[PDB]
Design an enzyme around this catalytic site. Structure first.
Site, PDB file in Angstrom:
ATOM      1  N   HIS B 351       0.796  -1.222   0.000  1.00 20.21           N
ATOM      2  CA  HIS B 351       0.000   0.000   0.000  1.00 20.21           C
ATOM      3  C   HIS B 351       0.839   1.287   0.000  1.00 20.21           C
ATOM      4  O   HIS B 351       0.290   2.367   0.248  1.00 20.21           O
ATOM      5  CB  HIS B 351      -0.911   0.060   1.236  1.00 20.21           C
ATOM      6  CG  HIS B 351      -1.845  -1.098   1.390  1.00 20.21           C
ATOM      7  ND1 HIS B 351      -3.152  -1.056   0.964  1.00 20.21           N
ATOM      8  CD2 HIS B 351      -1.681  -2.305   1.987  1.00 20.21           C
ATOM      9  CE1 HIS B 351      -3.751  -2.191   1.279  1.00 20.21           C
ATOM     10  NE2 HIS B 351      -2.879  -2.966   1.898  1.00 20.21           N
ATOM     11  N   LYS B 542      -9.055  13.846   4.545  1.00 18.51           N
ATOM     12  CA  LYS B 542      -8.083  12.756   4.508  1.00 18.51           C
ATOM     13  C   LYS B 542      -7.034  13.135   5.564  1.00 18.51           C
ATOM     14  O   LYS B 542      -7.009  14.272   6.034  1.00 18.51           O
ATOM     15  CB  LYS B 542      -7.424  12.617   3.124  1.00 18.51           C
ATOM     16  CG  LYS B 542      -6.829  13.916   2.609  1.00 18.51           C
ATOM     17  CD  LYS B 542      -6.395  13.870   1.144  1.00 18.51           C
ATOM     18  CE  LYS B 542      -7.547  13.734   0.163  1.00 18.51           C
ATOM     19  NZ  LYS B 542      -7.516  12.453  -0.580  1.00 18.51           N
ATOM     20  N   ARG B 543      -6.175  12.201   5.946  1.00 22.89           N
ATOM     21  CA  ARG B 543      -5.107  12.541   6.893  1.00 22.89           C
ATOM     22  C   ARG B 543      -4.210  13.658   6.317  1.00 22.89           C
ATOM     23  O   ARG B 543      -4.032  13.777   5.097  1.00 22.89           O
ATOM     24  CB  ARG B 543      -4.274  11.296   7.240  1.00 22.89           C
ATOM     25  CG  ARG B 543      -5.033  10.218   8.002  1.00 22.89           C
ATOM     26  CD  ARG B 543      -5.345  10.639   9.426  1.00 22.89           C
ATOM     27  NE  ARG B 543      -4.122  10.854  10.205  1.00 22.89           N
ATOM     28  CZ  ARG B 543      -3.570   9.976  11.039  1.00 22.89           C
ATOM     29  NH1 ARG B 543      -4.124   8.786  11.262  1.00 22.89           N
ATOM     30  NH2 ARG B 543      -2.454  10.306  11.681  1.00 22.89           N
ATOM     31  N   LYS B 548      -0.175  14.703   0.250  1.00 25.99           N
ATOM     32  CA  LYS B 548      -1.583  14.935  -0.098  1.00 25.99           C
ATOM     33  C   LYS B 548      -1.863  16.398  -0.485  1.00 25.99           C
ATOM     34  O   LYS B 548      -2.903  16.695  -1.073  1.00 25.99           O
ATOM     35  CB  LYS B 548      -2.500  14.467   1.047  1.00 25.99           C
ATOM     36  CG  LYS B 548      -2.512  12.943   1.202  1.00 25.99           C
ATOM     37  CD  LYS B 548      -3.148  12.490   2.511  1.00 25.99           C
ATOM     38  CE  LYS B 548      -3.173  10.976   2.689  1.00 25.99           C
ATOM     39  NZ  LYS B 548      -4.075  10.301   1.692  1.00 25.99           N
ATOM     40  N   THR B 650      -9.099   6.035  -1.604  1.00 29.84           N
ATOM     41  CA  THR B 650     -10.446   5.472  -1.520  1.00 29.84           C
ATOM     42  C   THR B 650     -11.499   6.533  -1.216  1.00 29.84           C
ATOM     43  O   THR B 650     -12.655   6.392  -1.650  1.00 29.84           O
ATOM     44  CB  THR B 650     -10.562   4.339  -0.488  1.00 29.84           C
ATOM     45  OG1 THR B 650     -10.139   4.809   0.788  1.00 29.84           O
ATOM     46  CG2 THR B 650      -9.738   3.143  -0.906  1.00 29.84           C
ATOM     47  N   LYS B 654     -15.570   7.288  -2.785  1.00 28.89           N
ATOM     48  CA  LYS B 654     -16.728   7.655  -1.965  1.00 28.89           C
ATOM     49  C   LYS B 654     -17.386   8.913  -2.496  1.00 28.89           C
ATOM     50  O   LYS B 654     -18.625   8.987  -2.576  1.00 28.89           O
ATOM     51  CB  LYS B 654     -16.344   7.882  -0.495  1.00 28.89           C
ATOM     52  CG  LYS B 654     -15.626   6.706   0.176  1.00 28.89           C
ATOM     53  CD  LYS B 654     -15.083   7.075   1.557  1.00 28.89           C
ATOM     54  CE  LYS B 654     -14.128   6.001   2.052  1.00 28.89           C
ATOM     55  NZ  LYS B 654     -13.413   6.431   3.239  1.00 28.89           N
TER      56      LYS B 654
HETATM   57  O1  LIG Z   1      -1.952   3.664   4.612  1.00 29.14           O
HETATM   58  C1  LIG Z   1      -1.135   3.271   3.781  1.00 29.14           C
HETATM   59  C2  LIG Z   1       0.282   2.757   4.143  1.00 29.14           C
HETATM   60  C3  LIG Z   1       0.492   2.241   5.609  1.00 29.14           C
HETATM   61  C4  LIG Z   1       1.783   2.897   6.058  1.00 29.14           C
HETATM   62  C5  LIG Z   1       2.128   2.825   7.421  1.00 29.14           C
HETATM   63  C6  LIG Z   1       3.497   2.868   7.709  1.00 29.14           C
HETATM   64  C7  LIG Z   1       3.985   2.874   9.013  1.00 29.14           C
HETATM   65  C8  LIG Z   1       3.114   2.867  10.089  1.00 29.14           C
HETATM   66  C9  LIG Z   1       1.724   2.865   9.837  1.00 29.14           C
HETATM   67  C10 LIG Z   1       1.233   2.855   8.505  1.00 29.14           C
HETATM   68  C11 LIG Z   1       0.790   2.842  10.875  1.00 29.14           C
HETATM   69  C12 LIG Z   1       1.376   3.257  12.244  1.00 29.14           C
HETATM   70  C13 LIG Z   1       2.725   2.603  12.504  1.00 29.14           C
HETATM   71  C14 LIG Z   1       3.714   2.883  11.373  1.00 29.14           C
HETATM   72  N1  LIG Z   1      -1.377   3.291   2.472  1.00 29.14           N
HETATM   73  C15 LIG Z   1      -2.664   3.722   1.928  1.00 29.14           C
HETATM   74  O2  LIG Z   1      -3.453   2.539   1.628  1.00 29.14           O
HETATM   75  C16 LIG Z   1      -4.736   2.858   1.058  1.00 29.14           C
HETATM   76  C17 LIG Z   1      -5.542   1.586   0.867  1.00 29.14           C
HETATM   77  O3  LIG Z   1      -4.860   0.789  -0.118  1.00 29.14           O
HETATM   78  C18 LIG Z   1      -4.525   3.623  -0.274  1.00 29.14           C
HETATM   79  O4  LIG Z   1      -5.805   3.976  -0.855  1.00 29.14           O
HETATM   80  C19 LIG Z   1      -3.703   4.887  -0.051  1.00 29.14           C
HETATM   81  O5  LIG Z   1      -3.418   5.484  -1.318  1.00 29.14           O
HETATM   82  C20 LIG Z   1      -2.376   4.541   0.667  1.00 29.14           C
HETATM   83  O6  LIG Z   1      -1.661   5.748   1.045  1.00 29.14           O
END
Ligand SMILES: O=C(CCCc1ccc2c(c1)CCCC2)N[C@@H]1O[C@H](CO)[C@@H](O)[C@H](O)[C@H]1O
Ligand SMILES: O=C(CCCc1ccc2c(c1)CCCC2)N[C@@H]1O[C@H](CO)[C@@H](O)[C@H](O)[C@H]1O
Lengths: 810, 810
Positions: B351, B542-543, B548, B650, B654
């Protein structure tokens, strides 16, 4: 099956069965194919609980309509045990649930064993509060029990290599179906901060806040449709609490929530620990806001007409300065008026005379944690001491003796002195104890305010301690005299007219025999232990403390063993000696005593010459549910504390009600028990309080007894030399040292009289008919020791309310 | 009221009313006199929950009978939001419950607002897992979601003085009626210790144990009577844990239980924190024991025929070495056979492409916490690199690039490399993203194993994201084309034949207007904010992250403000610009961006010359429940990430489904959205990925844009000089510095094209009929973006199972 267990109507049994299946499906989300016995227990508990709620709601509505005077029983401990059977008994549902579960292919007694004890107490004081709640509901009083919902109650005791090991009592692991969380009545409690003086009075500012969330448990009266409330507070952090970095701030919420985490297990040993003080203030501050809220939802002159607060020992003593704080600082009453209200509202029950059990909090702790309360306590002290000075002019010694503030290396507040000053009534818990309070430790206070001092002899509830635990005995009694005695225990006196009835004698003895067989089998099942059920069951169960003298029992056991070894072909009455109880984790001598008992067992139980004539068993994990099993099975009840040390005792009363004879000193309630039954029907031995005093004046010299009693010398030589610890010959040296040089409780001084008295017990047990006749005389005169009698006395003589036996409507 | 909300039969409404009253009495222990709206919410939730349980039990029985291949979706996040309305929708109960509650004198919409969000995720990744669970149940797959039951989810955001403040999300305070604790399926998880090599293989010994207790939540499919399970693990200490002294040992249980305490909020920023690694192993170890248990309760050659494990990013990547550990060390399979099983069982979804988001764990942490896993990872690496060497002989650079072990100052394990090596399928989440993975960051892996690499374009569930949140729109669609589109969203293409229908055009526009009025009123009610509902609603939620480009939006807002101030008497299309989202607590630039947005609002919203022509609002505490309100109300959806940075998005989908037009870059799924609707029906602007690459080759010089665009220079001078922060003139210097000298995301490079594109948006909005026609063309072509389509593709192309739309029986 038996009549005292109520009716099993067709309609009732049918409704219970369908509600049981409903809960199994919808509540537990299981079906019969995958359900475990634990699932079945929970389905039954939810089914029985449903029968409480209608009565619970309408009881509380009733109190709102009638607005009676409310009784608030504040305690840090409520030793409740299991709830399922008690609820069934009080609602007349036992036979119906037995039938219903039987028809579902289940054994109800097996499901009952799955419930965890609510072990939120250490021993007698905590269990007294539980008996009291039951009696208050049975007598129709508008009563509320208030305490702390500990996440971990008294530890589970395991014995490993003869040593006590502790493990956490995670009693909430599977859920508690009896409680109802009430997050909507959450209240703030303040700590630390500082006091600001404005023109408009004092203000307590810059405080840390912890939230108190209540959980309510129903307390059903006996067949009167009254259901009262026990409200227990749980600590929660506020959501901005402490608010990397962010993560650590969330994890640090545990600091606040630790207040309700665990029950202190060091009973009778006061320690000045901050966390314990936080627990004490937490329960008091949350409870008093709840009380005031309920009072306003109807001018504080009428507050004592609508509110009584009973302090269970000094543990909730901060209620006194907290009530003053609220009335003076927040409600703006003048000091004198607030004090009048406070005194008339509060009453204090003392449960100890041992000096190390008295709460004496370091001033520096109160200063940091509760700065406004310390100020109020100083003010109370100054005004009280001004009254003492005016009544006893020039008596400067009396002034320092009576002060709430103790001078010394560290300055301390004496919480007992605070409670006496701030209460309209002060009571002890048995006649001899209440007399000791007036003659010794509170003599000065009694001279100033004689009218404050009362006695309220303790009691036990005959619901849990006869009907629930000994249905066989309850039934044979009900056959002769009906069922009314269950809520009017004085009716047991009618049994005197059956002391020469051959049928009754046989039934009383049969019930005991069945209880003993049942317990002997429980022992093999759960602990691979193997006892002769024809032996005399000689039982001492209670917390392990030097004052209770489990060591004296040990010396008798070793005496019997040595006598057998000396004349092995002589007949002796066979005994099974059972000793049980928990030791406080840091109490080294108590831990050594447990080890000694198991070590004696290791020798005695495997000596082929002894055979099955003597067995010594340590009963592991003594708690309320185990008491309900062993007490009905006992022949002989050991109540052998040094005269003047056991304030009352309550285990003593449980044994009396269940057909054991008592061997005991003239201590606590033993005195009143012997007085009720007749001294000829009790096995009394040893020094009286007056004899202990005489010995202290001369000086107790244990060596004198060692020198004059050869049988005693033999035992000490066996302990010292490693007879009971061959691989570690010096193991019990601390015990021998204490006995010979530093024994505060004079074990040797009562040894000779104790052994001789035990011989008289064995003589009587050889004549089953006369043993049983003496038993009947004990059971028949046990009525005074119902906690219904006790509570009726608190109600009339302290709280100013009349008890009622009248039903609420169903 | 509306047809898509189902039938309100007399029998059904009557039964719901009586079950509601039953729960209020017996479950909540209240009556109508003292009940609060929260009590009423809970009574409704328990009533609806009862309708799930029969279907839940029989679904799980069905899977036991049929023994289908089971799908296990492992995720550290499940961003579920509220459950009550979703459950009613999927069970066809909404109108019945509406009627029932209305007849009881209650407003159901008011009760719905009381439920807490289950905010167990950060954003898109967590919400994707939630949409997926809904689609898997709707498509009849035997699927289980496995994760962690966080005590505290994503923090609640408050804005104080324009700054973000965080507070703990205590979502479990009042209880969670949807979950069922299953303490009977508790499992041990091991940490620390050391590895011993015996003759009979390796052994992991001297470990610390933490218990994993499961809580099950039902996941209902849409009107098919399937109810699947989400199982979330909670950490508990064993009862001998750590077992003064005694008290501290009990208090130290919190150390173990902290594993499940709180969700890490730093999404897209990897940190090597031990607690996070513990969370990751905890979910993996407990889940895999559960999987193996269920597989045995029917020889591991058949394991991949009965089990699929989907890894939601690398967060559960330890599943790979854990499965090897179990198969090799405990089940005694030889290495090669275990590896075959593992590869065929596991699949990995990526992702992200941002380097700082990739998990690269320090070896020293794995060494201490999970010593056996590190050994297994080294062995996997050696065998994998031997294959690389044989396929590309002499290419030593490829060997170091592809290694699972990263050499450097601190040695690290690349978890993405581990997942590719250990999985039979690797997918990205939109076509452009999946292509980027093969061409850039995983190029080497693609060259070695091209067959592993797939695309699965993301989707959203049309239950929550249309029927639930926008019933008005769902209804006018159902009027024309029936109800089948709710579970077959491609049927929305039929709406193309209504693009010239005057009635439909009017209804589509009326529904939007009603949504906007409803939201405008919600704003005043809960936040005393005061918007013109005739303005264009321009929304970016969004975050908050630099990629972004909320900052690009800000520059446009200030441009519009400056243009108005320059020619105040000229007509401009009125706008309400809404920006919302949470910033990670330690992400300073994200926090400064929130402050900038509020600061722009402070100036723009109070300038009398602007009037109601421009408003800028920061939407506080953006979360799933707020998305359900604002998205149906939006006119314009801002999807403006730098090309190549948003893997899919996503939120974009929506907005498309709910009748907003999109302004966006050719990034992530925007490309496929434009392709489906037609580029003429999308507002596309800015650099493509190829243009960004060209700029990077030359070197991005932001000064060039500042020098050539006077309107941009004006804004930078305003920021620098304190126009938006008069009392603190240097407040935004960090922002200006980043924009001018260190901007990784090229905000200035797309500024001119963005502003020009925004002018075309305003032009179209002046012609309501043509705006609405373009909307219809977007809604009508949104079908591809159903998560039912996505899951059907995972099922057929990765998991090897066929979806089903067939009902289970009720
Ligand atoms: O959220 C993410 C990546 C997760 C990255 C991540 C990396 C490190 C950490 C976290 C998340 C959570 C806290 C701990 C450390 N990607 C998003 O995934 C969505 C669903 O596929 C997608 O629509 C978004 O474009 C993408 O940024
Ligand atoms: O349990 C007590 C005294 C409570 C003493 C105490 C002192 C300090 C601490 C605790 C308890 C609990 C842990 C923290 C420190 N007294 C018993 O009360 C029974 C009920 O009235 C009575 O029958 C017993 O004779 C008496 O020992």
């Amino acid at each position: 099956q038996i009549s005292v267990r109520g009716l099993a109507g067709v309609e009732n049994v049918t409704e219970l069965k369908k509600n049981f299946n409903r809960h199994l499906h919808f509540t537990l989300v299981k079906d019969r194919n995958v359900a475990t016995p634990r699932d079945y227990y929970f389905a039954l508990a939810h089914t029985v609980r449903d029968h409480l709620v209608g009565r619970w709601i309408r009881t509380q509505q009733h109190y709102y309509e009638k607005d009676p005077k409310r009784i608030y029983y504040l305690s840090l401990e409520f030793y409740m045990g299991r709830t399922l059977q008690n609820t069934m008994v009080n609602l007349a549902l036992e036979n119906a649930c037995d039938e219903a579960t039987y028809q579902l292919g289940l054994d109800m007694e097996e499901l009952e064993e799955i419930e965890e004890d609510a072990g939120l107490g250490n021993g007698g004081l905590g269990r007294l509060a539980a008996c009291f709640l039951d009696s208050m509901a049975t007598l129709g009083l508008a009563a509320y029990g208030y305490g702390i919902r500990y996440e971990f109650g008294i530890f589970n005791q395991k014995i490993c290599g003869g040593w006590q090991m502790e493990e956490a009592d995670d009693w909430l692991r599977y859920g508690n179906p009896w409680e109802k969380a009430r997050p909507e009545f959450t209240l703030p409690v303040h700590f630390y901060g500082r006091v600001e003086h404005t023109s408009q009075g004092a203000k307590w500012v810059d405080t840390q806040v912890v939230l108190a969330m209540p959980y309510d448990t129903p307390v059903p009266g006996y067949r009167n449709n009254v259901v009262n409330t026990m409200r227990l507070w749980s600590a929660k952090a506020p959501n901005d609490f402490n608010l990397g970095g962010y993560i650590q701030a969330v994890l640090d919420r545990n600091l606040a929530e630790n207040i309700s985490r665990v029950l202190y297990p060091n009973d009778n040993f006061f320690e000045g620990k901050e966390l314990r003080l936080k627990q004490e203030y937490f329960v008091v501050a949350a409870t008093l806001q709840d009380i005031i809220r309920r009072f306003k939802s109807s001018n504080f002159d009428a507050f004592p007409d609508k509110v009584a607060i009973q302090l269970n020992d000094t543990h909730p003593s901060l209620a006194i300065p907290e009530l003053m704080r609220v009335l003076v600082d927040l409600e703006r009453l003048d000091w004198d008026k607030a004090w009048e209200v406070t005194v008339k509202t509060c009453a204090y029950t003392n449960h100890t005379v041992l000096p190390e059990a008295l709460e004496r909090w370091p001033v520096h702790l109160l200063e940091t944690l509760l700065p406004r309360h310390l100020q109020i306590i100083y003010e109370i002290n100054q005004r009280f001491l001004n009254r003492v000075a005016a009544a006893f002019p020039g008596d400067v010694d009396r002034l320092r003796r009576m002060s709430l503030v103790e001078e010394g290396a560290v300055k301390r507040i004496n919480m007992a002195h605070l409670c006496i000053a701030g209460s309209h009534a002060v009571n002890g818990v048995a006649r001899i104890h209440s007399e000791i309070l007036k003659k010794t430790i509170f003599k000065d206070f009694y001279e100033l305010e004689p009218h404050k001092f009362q006695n309220k002899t303790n009691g036990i509830t005959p619901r849990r301690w006869l009907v629930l635990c000994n249905p066989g005995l309850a039934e044979i009694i009900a056959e002769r005299i009906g069922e009314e005695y269950i809520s009017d225990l004085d009716q047991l006196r009618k049994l005197l007219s059956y002391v020469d009835d051959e049928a009754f004698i046989r039934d009383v003895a049969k019930v005991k025999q069945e209880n003993k067989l049942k317990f002997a089998a429980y022992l093999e099942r759960e602990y691979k232990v193997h006892i002769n059920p024809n032996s005399l069951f000689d039982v001492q169960v209670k917390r392990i403390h030097e004052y209770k003298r489990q060591l004296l029992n040990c010396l008798h056991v070793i005496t019997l063993y040595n006598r057998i070894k000396k004349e092995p072909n002589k007949f002796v009455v066979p005994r099974t000696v059972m000793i049980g109880g928990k030791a406080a984790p840091g109490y080294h001598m108590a831990k050594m005593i447990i080890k000694l008992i198991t070590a004696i067992g290791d020798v005695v139980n495997h000596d082929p010459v002894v055979g099955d004539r003597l067995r010594v068993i340590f009963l592991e994990n003594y708690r309320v549910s185990l008491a309900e099993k062993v007490i009905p099975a006992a022949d002989l009840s050991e109540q052998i504390s040094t005269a003047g040390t056991e304030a009352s005792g309550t285990g003593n009363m449980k044994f009396m009600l269940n057909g054991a004879l008592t061997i005991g000193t003239m201590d606590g309630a033993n005195v009143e028990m012997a007085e009720e039954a007749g001294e000829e029907n009790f096995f009394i031995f040893g020094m009286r309080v007056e004899d202990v005093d005489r010995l202290d004046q001369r000086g107790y010299n244990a060596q004198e007894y060692y020198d004059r009693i050869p049988e005693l010398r033999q035992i000490i030589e066996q302990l010292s030399s490693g007879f009971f610890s061959p691989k570690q010959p010096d193991l019990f040296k601390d015990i021998v040292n204490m006995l010979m040089h530093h024994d505060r409780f004079k074990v040797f001084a009562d040894y000779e009289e104790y052994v001789k008295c035990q011989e008289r017990v064995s003589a009587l047990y050889k004549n089953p008919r006369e043993w049983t006749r003496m038993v009947i005389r004990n059971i028949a005169t046990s009525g005074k020791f119902s906690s219904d009698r006790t509570i009726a006395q608190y109600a009339r003589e302290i709280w100013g309310v009349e008890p009622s036996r009248q039903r609420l409507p169903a």
